[PDB]
Design a protein around this nucleic acid. Sequence first.
RNA 1: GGUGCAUGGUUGUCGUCAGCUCGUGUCGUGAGAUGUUGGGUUAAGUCCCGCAACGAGCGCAACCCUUAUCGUUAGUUACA
RNA 2: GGCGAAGGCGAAAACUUAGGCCAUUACUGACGCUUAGGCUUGAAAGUGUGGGGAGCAAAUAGGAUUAGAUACCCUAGUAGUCCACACCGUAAACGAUAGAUACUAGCUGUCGGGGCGAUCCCCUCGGUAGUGAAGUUAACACAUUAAGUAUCUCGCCUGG
RNA 3: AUUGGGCGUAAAGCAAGCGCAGGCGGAUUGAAAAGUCUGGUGUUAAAGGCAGCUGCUUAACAGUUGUAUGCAUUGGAAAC
Lengths: 153, 240, 215, 5
Amino acid sequence: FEERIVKLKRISKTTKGGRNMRFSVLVVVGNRKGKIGYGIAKALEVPNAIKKAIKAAHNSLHTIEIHKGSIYHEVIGRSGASRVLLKPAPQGTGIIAGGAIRAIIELAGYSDIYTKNLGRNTPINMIHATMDGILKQLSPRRVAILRNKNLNE
Amino acid sequence: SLAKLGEMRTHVGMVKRYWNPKMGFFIEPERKHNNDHFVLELQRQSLQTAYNYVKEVAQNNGQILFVGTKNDYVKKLVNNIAKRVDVAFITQRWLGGTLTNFKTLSISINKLNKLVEKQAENAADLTKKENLMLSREIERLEKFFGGVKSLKRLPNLLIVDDPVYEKNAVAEANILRIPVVALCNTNTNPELVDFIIPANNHQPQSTCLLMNLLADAVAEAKAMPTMFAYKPDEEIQIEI
Amino acid sequence: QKVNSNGLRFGINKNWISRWTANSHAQTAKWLIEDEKIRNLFFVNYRNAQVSNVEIERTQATVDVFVYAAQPAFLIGSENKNIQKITKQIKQIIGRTTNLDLTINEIGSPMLSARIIARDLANAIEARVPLRTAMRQSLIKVLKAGANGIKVLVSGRLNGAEIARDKMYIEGNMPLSTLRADIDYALEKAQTTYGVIGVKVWINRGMIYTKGLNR
Amino acid sequence: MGNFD
RNA sequence: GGUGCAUGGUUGUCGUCAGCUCGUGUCGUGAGAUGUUGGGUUAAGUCCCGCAACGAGCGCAACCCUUAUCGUUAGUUACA
RNA sequence: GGCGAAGGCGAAAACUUAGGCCAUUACUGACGCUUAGGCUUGAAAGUGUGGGGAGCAAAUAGGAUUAGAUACCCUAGUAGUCCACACCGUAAACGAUAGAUACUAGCUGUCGGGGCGAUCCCCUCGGUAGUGAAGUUAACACAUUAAGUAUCUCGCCUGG
RNA sequence: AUUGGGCGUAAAGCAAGCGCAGGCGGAUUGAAAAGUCUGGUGUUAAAGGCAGCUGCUUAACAGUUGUAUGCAUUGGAAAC
């Protein structure tokens, strides 16, 4: 599809004889329909690292049902003292988030939600926090099933 | 029908008070003699469920693999089952990257097949030292791969004889979406296992009977009649 | 400090580059620079020649000319313009008594000729083609035809001082403790406004086991 | 899913 | 006439020691471990039973040459 | 190993006594948590009055160490090192976990009481210890003596 | 950092205890009246915001209409 890149961490490993250069790359894959995956790749060349990370992300796909581009109830993504709060938005207002969070939101499929990261700003931590937030949502039919009445009131 | 009781004389007993509360659903009373005792109704229901699933996957007509690394009695037993039931088997330590990855060992199985066809063609096309070296290579390859040579695609179903010592295999199976049945000894994690068989497996006297029952359950796929679960004769047991 | 594999495998595993001999220390230097003259002329003066190797055999004012080029369309070509000019120039540069009588015959799809691979890498380099795509193209063109191990190195600038990117790439089979590992090699000096880039390529021509002879 | 057949 | 504090090329060095990587998969939010991580053997990562790992590349050894043994083609400008 | 609010408390006693723990089927009935202020002690050293200096040893000296020996060892030696009065209140005064009421996987070792009842174990009320789930914490790691989720009151943190 | 942080090793638990006020605190019956909600009169000026109109070529802006934040206040609503 499109697969924007979000982080290009220039890193290396220092051993005897100096620092072997091997940088890391962050990618996120999605169909804009619910399926989401993310991938980390360390390599000494860019394109092979991108391919490896894309494959890894494609090997960890998962879908989420949609509520007209918004989230119907507040969720906060707990991740290593770095939490992102998600507050419901009206029926269509446009995207509002930080760059990595943004690309995450429009690749997931959503188009309107209030986002705010709390704490640090390490990209993978916000990625995991957003994953926790979106995963911990349950549909209204879910709570309908857990209760005797299975229907919208 | 099924689920006979009288012959199954030894089905309980477990190591000294290492049970986990996750198996407490299967221990109703309290035991004072440092052991455990299951309930026959639950194990008959589990046996029926296991029979249902194995007959379903036999109607699937897929591929099955057995694994085993603990006491050699179980090893030789599953070898027998392998030569009673056409199935792959493993006689040594389970190898990682076997079910979570296929190419890594598919290439090795293809190399073993290449060696097999080379040996089929070669009768006097090699020197002395290299012939013995290649025979030893064949032996080393079949030490881990000899049983597992009939699989050309990711396996549909396996079983687990001991969830404790082969936790690597059950974890790799749980990583993938394909199921697996386990001879669940008490204190094991039930969340990893999808079909639970609550019977003794550390002792061989129960493991042999359970293995024979599952072999009979899977043997119907060949139009080859069952051996036990309908025969009044008692099973054999010899140890010293 | 490493040894040259190409020179390592000469004399025992391949036919000779120049296997003639005459009286020594009387004129040997003259003839051994005169053959290098045509060697350099085919290696530099015609970038489209794609000559695989050079073979000169001199014997008392009688010389045979062995010329193997992957691209014959610029030595004979149309209206025979190239042959007369180059032969007259070579006759001027070697003497007016000998006979040339060159022979041309193509080799079997030289995707194992390291020399033309170095030529193509240069044609990329003076074209300012980036290293990565050029080396991928060369690796594809050498490997997809069907052959054994290759390894390529480039030494020098990449449009910038303080060289930080000069790597080694090997993607095949190449032993070094076995003379029975016949291989082809090329070293070339590409020219850029920033300097000279040394490109080296080794392409394995397979293992020649159970031969035990030099022809 | 018990229904691969 | 310059500047190896731009370069190619070649060479010294640790050292003819023996280690350095990669592919696939895994644990870890990450660095990174992972193979290479324990023991038996020499010069060795030489090999092997292992061990969430299976393999591949370089490393040396083999075929390369010389010498110490004999069979044979040749007995000359050496034997006589 | 046990008590002690903390530090600490080990030869033998008698005395005045202090706080627990366990069944409390008895009694009273919200009197229970905290408590900035105010008070109770306070490891060691030191201070000012009496014993003593047996050993010890800050300081001082002498002898070797290296260009250097105010330190590294040996000889002695200065008060103090205890028992009584009045101080001084600082400790890495450490479980680096403020003080109480809940609940939550297990497993093992260990002290007291009750009945059981030779020691050996079966339970209960408790304290003292490791192991180790979910769960939590950045990680180390914590866990029935929470750093888990709760809640209450006093203090502290907003860069060296 | 109430809403929206912490105090084991990153800055941070007073070395502890006895401990006034001060904040809390098992359960019920009944009256309650300080909070909690329903009611309007006084306001809370107007302007300023918020929305709708009117006009200067629309806008700037000006005006118009209502819009609310707080205490009296008299009925009542009974769990905290």
